[model samples]
Target: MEAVLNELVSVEDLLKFEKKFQSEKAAGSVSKSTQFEYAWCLVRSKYNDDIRKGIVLLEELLPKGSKEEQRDYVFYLAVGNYRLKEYEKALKYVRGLLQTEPQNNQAKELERLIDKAMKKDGLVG
Candidate 1:
C-alpha cells in the first residue's frame, strides 16, 4: 500500500486509480477496503486540491474502520482544516487524535504546530 501510495503524485494518477477501483468494484474484484485506501492516499497527499472531499470520505469510513483508519481520518481532518485556516476546527480534530493516541508523535507534533499557528493569530491564549 505504501508503494502504491508513494506513486500517486498527480491528479491523473489519482483519477486513474479511482477509475480502476470503480471498474474492479463493478466486476466484484474490489472491496471497500481498497476504496478506503484510495481515499486515504488522497487525504494524505500534498498534491490533492479537494482535501475536504477526502476528509469527508475518511470521516464516513471511520465508524467501521480499523484503528489505523481512525487515525487517518482524524489526522487528515486536522490537516485539512488547518490548511483552510480553520484553526478551531483543526484543534477539535487534533485534540481528538491526542485523546485516543496519547503517544502519537505525528499527532503531537501537528498539535504543537496548530497551537503555535493559533497563538500567533491570537486565537488561543
Candidate 2:
C-alpha cells in the first residue's frame, strides 16, 4: 500500500488507481485503504493544492477504523486546511482531533500558525 502511495504524485495518478480499485472492489483492491494512502501522500507532497479532497477522503475513512488512525489522519487534514487558508474550518477540525489525542503537537502548532495568519491579515486570531 505504501509502495503504491509513494508513486502517486498527481491527482491524475490517484484517480487512475482509484478507478482500478473501484472496478475491482470485490477483489480486495483496497479502495478505502488506497484513499487513505492517497490522502497521506497529498499531505507529504512538495506542494499540495487539492488538500480539501484529501481532508474529505481522510474524514471518510474514519468509519469503523482505529482511533489512532483517525487522530493521525485528522491532524494531517488540519495541517492541510491550514495551508489552504481555511483557518476557521481548520481550527474546528483540529479541536475535534484534540478531543481524541490531546498531545498531538502538530495540530497545536497549526492552530498557532492559523492564529498568526489571521492576525497578520488584521482580522481575528
Candidate 3:
C-alpha cells in the first residue's frame, strides 16, 4: 500500500524526544528503550544529520541487544543508511537481517528499495 516508506516522524516530535533523551542523559544513564526510541525518531527525521546520528546510535546498540532487539535495530539502521543515500550500507544491514530471518517482510522490502535506489543512482549495473 506504499505505506512503509511514506511514514515519517515530525520534526517537533523529534525535538521532543531529543529533549527527553538529553534530560535523561544529564540525570544519569539512559534506558535502552528511551535511547532506541530517540534513535528511531532521529532516523525518521528529514535531516540527513539526524539520520546519521540515528545510525550511530543504532550501531552502538546492535551488539548489546537480544536477537529480536538486534533485528529491530538492524531494520532501522537500514532505514537510516537508506535515507542518507548510503545504499551499500543499507543493503548490508537489510541483508544481514534477511540472513537471520529470511521471512522478514520489512527487511525484504528494505532490500528491494535499496536495490531500486542503487540502480537509479547507477551504483548497480
Question: Sorted by TM-score, highest first, which candidate order results?
Answer: 3, 1, 2
TM-score of 3: 0.89
lDDT string, candidate 3, 1-125, tens digits: 55566548886888888998899899998778888999999888877888899998889888789988998999999899988988878888889889999999888888888898888888972
TM-score to true structure, per model: 0.71, 0.67, 0.89
True-structure RMSD, every candidate: 4.7, 5.6, 2.1
Regions more than 4 Å wrong, model 3: 1-7
lDDT of 2 by residue, 1-125 (tens): 33555543676776665566456556765665677777776665546565666777777777746877767777777777877777787788888877776787877777788888878878773
Candidate 2: Cα lDDT at 59: 76
Give the top-scoring candidate (lDDT): 3
Is candidate 1 or 2 superior in lDDT?
Answer: 1
Per-model CA lDDT versus the true structure: 0.74, 0.71, 0.87
What does candidate 1 score on TM? 0.71
Ranking by lDDT: 3, 1, 2
Q: What is the lDDT for 59 in model 3?
A: 91
Clashes of 2: 0
